[PDB]
Amino acid sequence: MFREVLPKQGQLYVEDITTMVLCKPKLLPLKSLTLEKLEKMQQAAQDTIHQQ
Amino acid sequence: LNVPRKTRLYVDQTLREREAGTAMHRTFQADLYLLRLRAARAYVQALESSLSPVSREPLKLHAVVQGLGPTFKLTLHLQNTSTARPILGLVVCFLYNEVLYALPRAFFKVPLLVPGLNYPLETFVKSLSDKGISDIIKVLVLREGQSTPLLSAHINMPMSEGL
Amino acid sequence: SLFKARDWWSTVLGDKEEFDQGCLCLADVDNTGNGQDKIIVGSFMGYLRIFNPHPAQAEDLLLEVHLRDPILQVEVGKFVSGTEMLHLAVLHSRKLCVYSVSGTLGNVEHGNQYQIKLMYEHNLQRTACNMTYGSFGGVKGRDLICIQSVDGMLMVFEQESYAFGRFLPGSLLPGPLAYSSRTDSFITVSSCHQVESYKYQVLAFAVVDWTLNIGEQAIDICIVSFIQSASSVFVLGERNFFCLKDNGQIQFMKKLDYSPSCFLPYCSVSEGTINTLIGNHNNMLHIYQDVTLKWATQLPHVPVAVRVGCLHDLKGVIVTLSDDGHLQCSYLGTDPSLFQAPKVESRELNYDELDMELKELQKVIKNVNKDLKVSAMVSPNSVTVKVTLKNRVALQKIKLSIYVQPPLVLTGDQFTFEFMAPEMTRTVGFSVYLKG
Amino acid sequence: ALTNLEDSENAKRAYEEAVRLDKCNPLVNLNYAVLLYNQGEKRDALAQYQEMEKKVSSSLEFDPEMVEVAQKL
Amino acid sequence: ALWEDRDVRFDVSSQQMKTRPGEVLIDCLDSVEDTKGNNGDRGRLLVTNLRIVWHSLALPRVNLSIGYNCILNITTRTANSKLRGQTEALYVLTKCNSTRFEFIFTNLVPGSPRLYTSLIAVHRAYETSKMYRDFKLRSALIQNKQLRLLPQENVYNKINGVWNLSSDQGNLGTFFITNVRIVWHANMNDSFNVSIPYLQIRSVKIRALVIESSQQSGGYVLGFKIDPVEKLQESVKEINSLHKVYSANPIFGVDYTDAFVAYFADGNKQQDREPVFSEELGLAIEKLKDGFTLQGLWEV
Amino acid sequence: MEPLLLAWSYFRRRRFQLCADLCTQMLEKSPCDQAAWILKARALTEMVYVDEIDVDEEGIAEMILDENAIAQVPRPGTSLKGPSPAVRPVTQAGRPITGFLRPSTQSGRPGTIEQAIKTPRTAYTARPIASSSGPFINLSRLNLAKYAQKPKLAKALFEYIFHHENDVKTALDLAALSTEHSQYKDWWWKVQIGKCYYRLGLYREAEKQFKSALKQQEMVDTFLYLAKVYISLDQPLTALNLFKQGLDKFPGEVTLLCGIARIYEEMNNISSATEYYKEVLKQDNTHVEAIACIGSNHFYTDQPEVALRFYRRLLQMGVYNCQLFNNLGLCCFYAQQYDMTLTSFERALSLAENEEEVADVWYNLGHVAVGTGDTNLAHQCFRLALVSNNQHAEAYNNLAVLEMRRGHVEQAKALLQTASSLAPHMYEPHFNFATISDKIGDLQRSYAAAKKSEAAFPDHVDTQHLIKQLEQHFA
């Protein structure tokens, strides 16, 4: 019945070093209903043009 | 300070994590294994088709389209990315739908690429369809002694706005 | 389960049949008197079906009779001259038929039969479109029937015979018809965006009592009257949702962002307000307190003519009927369910085959990081060049182009070959000449 | 952490990596001794205890487990 | 007796996946990966006559069997654009004995997605044909005076004046005998008709024409009585012969472990609490869970 | 059963193919039948209908070559023309990325025709910019002076001409004849004439009709139309007063509150747009717009669990997208729910109907991977984001960061140059290029890059220290 002991002290930065930054995660914006309808009406014309 | 504040959602989530941490760990490791699998799969498929515009043998190419109207300016920004080594024999070949776009010179040699300079190599694409039809255009950069493209790029040509 | 319409007795109702509004009715056509309603559905394919559902099961379908001509807008009201017992009205395109669903019992759950008798009929000169029923004027204990026509005319039957019939002034496409009892008025929505109310005795004497120019044409109009405090008239357009007063002006309106198909202002809760529920074409139900959404649910099908009724000791069950043939009684789902990955100790990740595939792919990756013959022949004579290409493997999407120089001009530039079987030769011929 | 994630073999190999890659921190040795003694071995737990005592001193709670895994071994 | 088109089973045996006598395979597709269970393992999909089967194709033990009388919605999703070919995906929603599952089937190799079409087709054929393998009361069977036959059905014996020992005064009615099902209408208000399929019959004996149901339509004992018993025993023996010759090869009239827990459509929910009334909304609502409230579940 | 009845019932049930299919018959059978005529007209015009309120492309020509705002340099805070770019991704010099793309989004405006042309076609609108923003009936054959007498025909005919054929001039002719037939007493014809004007270019001549229609009968439609007109004249504070007037008329309308919130977000004071989106929620609670916006704002102001709740709500309401599931993945990972994280990204990759959506999902998977460690998986994910969308600048920047982590400086320099060439409005590629240059030397390139960084994110900190050090080296 022994519990493993954890260090109570973390790692602390002692100087700020210029590191190359990464771009940030990108939440894909949702669409409206008018926009979806417009895109689908734009692609349906293409489909009928190709299907003739 | 601006130290944030956590609502009931946070304590309920931490309680779930404290009571069901093992299942979360296991399922996240399984998901990570499957993600490594699928990423390696897609990387190998891209290497097969040579669809990466960034791929010893150092290069980097990306194609920009400019302009509305039936005539678009398509400029390929190509760049040799190496310490000091030029690339002598390379050539660019375009793949398009010959019924929608009229490329004057769909194949041309590229100048000696000096390491560090972005070469803009531009062409004039022209939409031929009287109806608005947007079709992709592929670009392949390849050696002159080889037949497998060194790298490739894609461009979705916008609508024509013709007359 | 949250925001889903959890399922109750549900069924599919035929072989690619087709329904519309007015089809789904829900009342005591059996005249038991106990309160439990019974579903009635009639398609314009012909079959009239009546159900007494219990929470799939065989004995649920009371009867599935078939009439020859199509069926429009089954209704349940006191459509007989003598008694105060509910009778079932079936409106075929050129026919009216009052029936009576009499159920006799046997000494077993499935020994009980149900007989419909054609109490009376009515030949319809014009082609019927839809109808309404109510105690026209101030009569009580009677349910007269005002049927419309596809060409505007509205004909009124006083529960026995052809009372009269008057043409609607200025209508082309017949819209939804209803009858308000607190004002004794037939309210319709003409083709020209006008919600119009006519007093009954005015039409009986043949005009417009009042009009309101809503922005569109309405799909349905449902005058609800279980509240005697402040009367209102609901009008569901194809783009908006109005609740009008009794004088003729908008009490309030909602600008819906979806496409409604059906609505039903059912029993209310607060003082003065009226709960209502509307069905998208996006497979959802919305439950407003007259403007304000109080709940929403994700239905299975596109609801046509929803109803709310007490079915087998459960009050307020929502009965929906699609136009393809589905039907479903349902209750709202109010169970917020933890979002958490399922614990399936049985299902393990097969490390052997997956590691084989990953070793293969990683081998390809770490390895890469370290078919056709063309020939040209020029003639010895504007010289004609001929290019022959021959493949080893079968190839596809072949494009052959020629580039000489600026001054020299070719009579042919591009040549397109489609798929070619292996060991097949292709020759092209063009001519080059100086121009400049 | 691993020890608490129902994966003791991975904890074994991780502790081996650590003890090979650690030089002047006895906490690793004491924790590996605790893992071993809880695994019912009590044999290599003495090896990790002796490795720790060869490495050595201030933490209040690493002192007690030092003496409790000693006396109980 | 017959469960292939009535249940949804997981980790099925190598024998229960085999085509039942009346069953018949239609279409197959290899490399169909299974999802909604993130095992990332391939398989093989089969659209049979009565159910859809999927077996792992590498560890064929782990598998899925979904009956057609237990599916609600089947949706095909064409996505995953130009990067590769247009690959499809199959979403099946199932509800067996009040438990909702959902399975997803991803066609890995984009070179053969046609399967996902035929399934839809046969599913319609499964639902447009339920008078072949199910029991129904008081349906719309009779024409002006005759029976409306199914596609693969012809009458055998045409008997008039056959009583029904389940009612009191609406009995005397015709008795139609066919190769798929046996029906009786009432010849007087001819909507009291019963259409029993041979599939649901368990044993036809006499105690009088007693017909028992096969534990699916309940213990529905049907009793009929005819003229002097000569034709009666004749009908009983011919009915038994037809029953056996049908059960030899069924028809079905279709023209042309913790595994469950990882396939729930709701998410960690296999349940439906008792639907009780709701004074707040005025609708029949599912019972609330020990402290929750409607206006507290609605807000965010 | 009957032709006209079955066709009209198909129309009621929103079939819109069968309806026309029976009317075409019914019209071939009888050359004199106007019921089926206008019914087929309705069906045709409603297969393509889209309400004019939320169609505000404007385009490149309107953006520069059309000046309508009275004030040229109005006070900051009264014209349309939060988290810093160090947290929230951006699209222009400012204008952080929004939730709920709508086809009326302008999201900044270009300065010159050249800049608008030489930029990506979809960097100022939800759709690529445009310079300008047999047949059933031939418009040149019918005498609108005779259909105007019959309003039952005139209304459907105008809807056909306007929304199907898009003939604003003939539509306006018909609407003028109709309005003069009604003696200017029906608000609908006034609203339609105002719409004809508004898409002809005449805003004041449209505001006149919309005001005169509001005087007839208050409707949410006319309020939103005036809101569009006022926003076109660059007058936010007039549109807000008009919206509060409308809410005084309709006490709890959701579209009006949502328009107020949209105007407050265009003016970029989120502290009131959140309040108005919360009012929308108190009214609707299924509103995709308000839920998405409050969810994004909750995610980026380091509260990803509340955003995960707000997006699980949209998941509960049957919404099934690629955007929604990638959002759920980001939230689950950053809210520390590692069980439902990667399956959401898998559903996203499954649902993506594009090559840019797939690239964004692979970009976010690379973010997940680099948060897990194992920089090789993130390397592969960024390269796949590039392979899917060649003009993906964030993938270039992150892949160059990982390359310089490995050691390959020239690869990182070239990739950062490509990123800063594709998206100049971003600050990370410029800052990283300046940093690596200064690390090796080349203080001229470091200055030319750090100054563009300061031009992109002008309140940065490390950019200021870099510029100070550089200007100190120059003396």
Numbering used by the authors:
A (entry chain H): 7 to 58
B (entry chain D): 425 to 479, 483 to 590
C (entry chain I): 2 to 56, 63 to 213, 234 to 397, 410 to 420, 439 to 493
D (entry chain E): 347 to 402, 408 to 424
E (entry chain G): 6 to 212, 219 to 267, 296 to 339
F (entry chain F): 1 to 81, 90 to 141, 158 to 499
Pull verbatim passages from the article behind this deposition.
Following on our previous strategy, we purified the BBSome to near-homogeneity from retinal extract and analyzed its structure by single-particle cryo-EM. The advent of higher throughput direct detector cameras and faster automated data-collection procedures combined with improvements in data processing with new tools implemented in RELION-3 led to a BBSome map at an overall resolution of 3.4 Å from an initial dataset of 770,345 particles. The BBSome is composed of 29 distinct domains characteristic of sorting complexes. α-solenoids, β-propellers, pleckstrin homology (PH) and appendage domains are all present in multiple copies and our previous map made it possible to build a Cα backbone model that encompassed 25 out of 29 domains. For building the current model, the previous Cα model was docked into the map, and the higher-resolution map enabled us to confidently assign side chains for most regions. The new map allowed us to build the coiled-coil domains of BBS1 and BBS9, for which densities were not well-defined in the previous map. Altogether, 27 out of 29 domains distributed across the 8 BBSome subunits could be modeled. Despite the increased resolution of the current density map, the gamma-adaptin ear (GAE) domains of BBS2 and BBS7 could not be modeled, and side chains could not be assigned for BBS2βprop, BBS2cc, BBS7βprop and BBS7cc. Consistent with our previous observations based on a 4.9 Å resolution map of the BBSome, the new BBSome structure cannot accommodate binding to ARL6GTP. Fitting a homology model of the bovine BBS1βprop–ARL6GTP complex in either BBSome structure caused a steric clash between ARL6GTP and a region encompassing BBS2βprop and BBS7cc. These data support a model in which the BBSome exists in an autoinhibited form in solution and undergoes a conformational opening upon recruitment to membranes by ARL6GTP, similar to other sorting complexes such as COPI, AP-1 and AP-2.
